């Protein structure tokens, strides 16, 4: 059982996460230009509120390299609710099994950083 290599982007507003073409891949100096491609997957947790009924928390969007993670089998551009795709110029459309996912027992998450000039929808924040 594994985890995203990066911390999540929390959705504070009504808009799903979306990036303009060529944007959205997190910075990771340990990966190469061919690897800069993947998807974000929405994870929506539920909690028992103060009243006593269940409710959704803010959705969290986690990045996974193409061909890894909970949707490792999906090809780039696959239509699936809660999955959005991103790729940098120069990336290769091949599975990134060599990067894989993170084992939290032996690796901390990488703080998710987006390069300068990256635009986001309302309610998401870039570090
Ligand atoms: Cl947050």
Numbering used by the authors: 48 to 174
Please quote the paper that reports this structure.
All crystal structures of nat_mutants with WT-like RNA-binding (nat_mutants P67S, A119S, E136D and P151S) superimpose well with the NTD WT with RMSD values between 0.592 and 1.776 Å. Mutated residues in the above-named nat_mutants lie peripheral to the structural core, which further supports both the converging structures and the unaltered apparent RNA-binding affinities.
